[PDB]
Amino acid sequence: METHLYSDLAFEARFADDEQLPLHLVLDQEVLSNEEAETLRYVYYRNVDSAGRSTGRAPGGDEDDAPASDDAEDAVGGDRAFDRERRTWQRACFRVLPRPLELLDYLRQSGLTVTLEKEQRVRMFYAVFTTLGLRCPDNRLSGAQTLHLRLVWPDGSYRDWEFLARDLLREEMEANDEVARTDEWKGAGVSRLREVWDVQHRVRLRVLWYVNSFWRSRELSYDDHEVELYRALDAYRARIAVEYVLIRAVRDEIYAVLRRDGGALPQRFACHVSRNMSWRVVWELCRHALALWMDWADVRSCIIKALTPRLSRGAAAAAQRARRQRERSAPKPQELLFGPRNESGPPAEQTWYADVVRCVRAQVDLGVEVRAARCPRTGLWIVRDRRGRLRRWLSQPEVCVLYVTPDLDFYWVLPGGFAVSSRVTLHGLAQRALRDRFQNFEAVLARGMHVEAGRQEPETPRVSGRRLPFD
Amino acid sequence: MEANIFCTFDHKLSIADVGKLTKLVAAVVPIPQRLHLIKHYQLGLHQFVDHTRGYVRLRGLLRNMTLTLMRRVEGNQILLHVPTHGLLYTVLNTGPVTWEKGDALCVLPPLFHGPLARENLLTLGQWELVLPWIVPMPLALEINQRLLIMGLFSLDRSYEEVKAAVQQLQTITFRDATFTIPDPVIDQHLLIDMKTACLSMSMVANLASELTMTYVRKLALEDSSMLLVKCQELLMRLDARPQHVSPDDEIARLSALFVMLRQLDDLIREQVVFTVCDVSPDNKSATCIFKG
Amino acid sequence: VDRWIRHAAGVERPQLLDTETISMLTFGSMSERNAAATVHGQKAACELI
C-alpha cells in the first residue's frame, strides 16, 4: 500500500520535468512464481511511443539505427550503444507480500476505503505492489503507446512483458490544524480494479486506480487513431521478429554454403568413420534434422546466447586487447631475458553453445553449453560436457548439431563429424534492434551487496512467506 | 563488579607463546560477555571476523563488547582486568596509528595497512589474537563518515560509476600514515543509519529559520575570502530586509535544529573510551583516563 | 644509410653469430680489441649527455 502512495507523491513531485503519470499495479501468481516473487530484486519499466521509439533516446533518431557490424572490434556499438540502452530503462519501487491474501480485504485492513462497482473478490498466493509511469509527452496520451515491464532477479536474469496504453486506458480514459495528503489518500480510497493483459496475452496483471491521485486533477486528453495503432503494431512486429530473422539468416547461410561447396563436407570433429556405411541415409537424416531445427528453433537458440555476451560493455575493449595480443611482434632476446614474461594466450578450451536436434523422436535442445578444444594429433574439435565428459552425440546417426562459437562462427555437424562452417551475419538487424532486445542487465547496488566489485556476495536477500519476518 | 577476569587456555602454550603474551601486557582486548571465567576462544575479535559480511557488522559487534586490559600471564591463565571510569591506566597501541597528547581515543575494527603483514599474533591452532585498533577521534569519525558517504552515494549506482569514487573514499590519510577500509558492504545496519540521516536532514531543511537559510548569500554579498569561495562553490551548480523578526521563533527553531544536528552527528561520532595524557616517545604505550 | 653512417663513424658491421652469441653477449661479453701501443695508460672514455 505504502509503495503506491509514495510513488504517487514521487511522480507528482517530478511531473513537470518528466510528464509521467503514475500507474499503480499489483502482480500475483498469474505473472510470477513464488520463488521469483520472494527473490525479486528490481523492477524496471520502459516507454515506447506509437512509432516504436523509446523515450530515453534522441526524439528524432539515433546512430543505433545503422545496421550491425559483425566485428568483434565494434561489438554492435560498444560502450556508447550499451549506455544508450541502459539509459532507456527506468527503475520502479516495489514491495512483495509473500503470504496468501485476498486483495480487497488487504486494502480494507490497511487504511483504504474500497467502493468498487461490483464487489468481486480476488485471491492471490502472493502480491507484488509496484508503480510504473506511462509518459504523456504532453498533456496528451495516446492509445498506441506501449509500456514495458521488466522483472529482474539477483543472478541478473530478467523477464520482459509489454502492453500498450490502449489496453490500460480502455475504460479509464474512455469515461473521462491542517489536513495531510496521507489521510485523505487513505480516506478517498480505491474505486477501480481492472485486469490487463500484455499484447501477446501471456500474462495478466491488475491495475489499481485511486480517486485521490494527482492523475485526476490534470484533465489532460487521450486519443487513439487507427493509423497510429497500425504503426505501433508494425513496430511491435519488428520487435519480436529479431530472433527469427537471425535464425533464418543462419538457415540461408547453411544452404548457401552447401550450394557453394557442392555438398562436400570436410571433417571438423573427431569421430572414427567407416566407408562401408549407407552415408546416403545419413544425408536424408540431415535433411530431416535441418527441417526440424527450423520447426523448433526459438529465442533460446544457441545464436542468441552467443550474441548476448557480445552486447556486454566489456566486449569491444576485450576484443581489441585480444587482437593486439594475437598479432604481437615476436619478442626480442632482450625482452625474454630481462623484461616481463608474455601474456598467456587463449586457453586451450573454449565455451560454446549448441542446438542438438534428434530426429527419431522429434526433439530439439536449444540452450546447450559445451566445452570445445582441438585435440593435439589432428586439429579437429573435441566437444565435451561441461562436467568434463566427452559428448557422445557425434556417434548417433539420428542427430545433427548446430554449434555457434563465441566469435560467431557456426558449424552444422552431421553424424561422423562432417560439418558446414560459416559465420552468422548480423547485417540484417539494425544495431538498436539487437541491442535493445538482447542486452544483458547490469545491476545497480542495493541491500546486502559489496561496494567493491568482484566480491563473493553474502547470503542473497529474500522475503520469506514461510518464516516469521526478521527485524 | 567482576573487576578481574580469568582467561584459561586449552592449547598448551609454548615458551614463545608465553613470551609474546607477556609483551602484550596492558593491551586493550575485548570480551563479549563480561564473565569471571572465560575460555581463550572468546578472547579477541576472532570469534566474529568474517570478511564476506562487511565492516559495519564487525563494527556493530565491537561497539557492544566489554573491553579489558591484559595483565600477567601464568600457566594457561591470562588474567584480564576491566578498567573503571575516571581512573588512570597504561594502555598499549598495537595498532599502527600515531597518538598525540590530549587525544580522545575510540575503538574500531582494524583497517588494512600497507605492508599487508599486520603481525599475526598467537595463532593457536586456527584461533588468533585479533585485537581492535585504538584510534583517536578524528580518524574514527573520518572512517565512519567515509563509510556512511559510500553507503549513501553508491546506492542505485552501477559498479562502473561506483568504482573510482569508492576507491577514493576507502583510502584515509592520517598523520602521514595511509589506511584502507576493508569491506564496506551495504548492510541492513548501514541502511538504518542512512534512513536516520535522511530523516534528520529533512528536519534540518524543514525547521531551519530563514536567517539560518540565507546567511551565506548575504555574507557573499558583503564579504569575499577563500573560505567563502569554497562555500559558494559547493552551492554553485544549483545556484533583503527580513519580513519576520522573531527572537522567540529563532530560539524555538534553533533549539530544535540542534537536536536534529545531534541526531545526524551520532551517525558519525563514536564513544570515547580513553583520553591520553602521557605518550611514550616511541609511541608504543600511553597513560590514559578510562571513559564510557 | 646504415653502411654510409658506419663508414663515416668508422665502425664495422655488427659481427655476431646472431642467435647464441647474442644471448651470450646479453649475458655479458668483452668485445673491444686493444690498441697496438699505450703510452697514456688506460682509456678513460667520455660519456656524452
UniProtKB/Swiss-Prot annotation, chain A:
Function comment: Capsid vertex-specific component that plays a role during viral DNA encapsidation, assuring correct genome cleavage and presumably stabilizing capsids that contain full-length viral genomes.
**Ranges of biased composition (kind: Acidic residues):** 61-76
Subcellular location per the Swiss-Prot or TrEMBL entry? Virion; Host nucleus
Q: What is the organism field in this record?
A: Human cytomegalovirus (strain AD169) (HHV-5)
**Chain spans, region Disordered:** 52-77, 322-347, 454-471
Which HAMAP family does UniProt cross-reference here? Answer: HSV_CVC1 (MF_04017)
Q: Name the chain's protein.
A: Capsid vertex component 1
What are the protein's UniProt keywords?
Answer: Capsid protein, Host nucleus, Late protein, Viral genome packaging, Viral release from host cell, Virion
Q: How does it assemble?
A: Interacts (via C-terminus) with capsid vertex component 2/CVC2.
Q: Which GO terms describe its biological process?
A: chromosome organization; viral DNA genome packaging
Q: According to the lineage, what is the superkingdom?
A: Viruses
Cellular component aspect of the GO annotation: host cell nucleus; viral capsid
Q: Which family is it part of?
A: Belongs to the herpesviridae CVC1 protein family.
Check the record and name the InterPro entries matching this protein.
Answer: UL17-like (IPR007640)
Swiss-Prot record, chain B:
Keyword Acyltransferase in the entry? The reply is no
Source organism, top-level taxon: Viruses
Question: Where is it mostly found?
Answer: virion
**The keyword Metal-binding appears for this protein:** no
Which compartments does it reside in?
Virion; Host nucleus
GO cellular component labels: host cell nucleus; viral capsid
List the Pfam families.
Herpes_V23 (PF01802)
| Keyword annotations of the record | Capsid protein, Host nucleus, Virion
Q: Which GO terms describe its molecular function?
A: structural molecule activity
Show the HAMAP family listed in the entry. HSV_TRX2
Q: Which family does it belong to?
A: Belongs to the herpesviridae TRX2 protein family.
**Subunit arrangement?**
Interacts with TRX1 and major capisd protein/MCP.
What is its biological role?
Structural component of the T=16 icosahedral capsid. The capsid is composed of pentamers and hexamers of major capsid protein/MCP, which are linked together by heterotrimers called triplexes. These triplexes are formed by a single molecule of triplex protein 1/TRX1 and two copies of triplex protein 2/TRX2. Additionally, TRX1 is required for efficient transport of TRX2 to the nucleus, which is the site of capsid assembly.
Write down what this protein is called.
Answer: Triplex capsid protein 2
Q: What lineage does UniProt assign to this protein's organism?
A: Viruses, Duplodnaviria, Heunggongvirae, Peploviricota, Herviviricetes
UniProtKB/Swiss-Prot annotation, chain C:
Q: Which domain of life is it from?
A: Viruses
Signal peptide residues on this chain, from the entry's feature table: none
List locations, semicolon-separated: Virion; Host nucleus
- Subunit structure, briefly? Homomultimer. Makes the hexons and eleven out of twelve pentons. Interacts with triplex proteins 1/TRX1 and 2/TRX2; adjacent capsomers are linked together in groups of three by triplexes, heterotrimeric complexes composed of one molecule of TRX1 and two molecules of TRX2. Interacts with scaffold protein; this interaction allows efficient MCP transport to the host nucleus. Interacts with capsid vertex component 2/CVC2. Interacts with the small capsomere-interacting protein/SCP.
Family classification: Belongs to the herpesviridae major capsid protein family.
The role this protein plays is: Self-assembles to form an icosahedral capsid with a T=16 symmetry, about 200 nm in diameter, and consisting of 150 hexons and 12 pentons (total of 162 capsomers). Hexons form the edges and faces of the capsid and are each composed of six MCP molecules. In contrast, one penton is found at each of the 12 vertices. Eleven of the pentons are MCP pentamers, while the last vertex is occupied by the portal complex.
Protein name per UniProt: Major capsid protein
Origin organism of this chain? Human cytomegalovirus (strain AD169) (HHV-5)
Covered part of the full sequence, start to end and full length, is: 1127 to 1175 of 1370
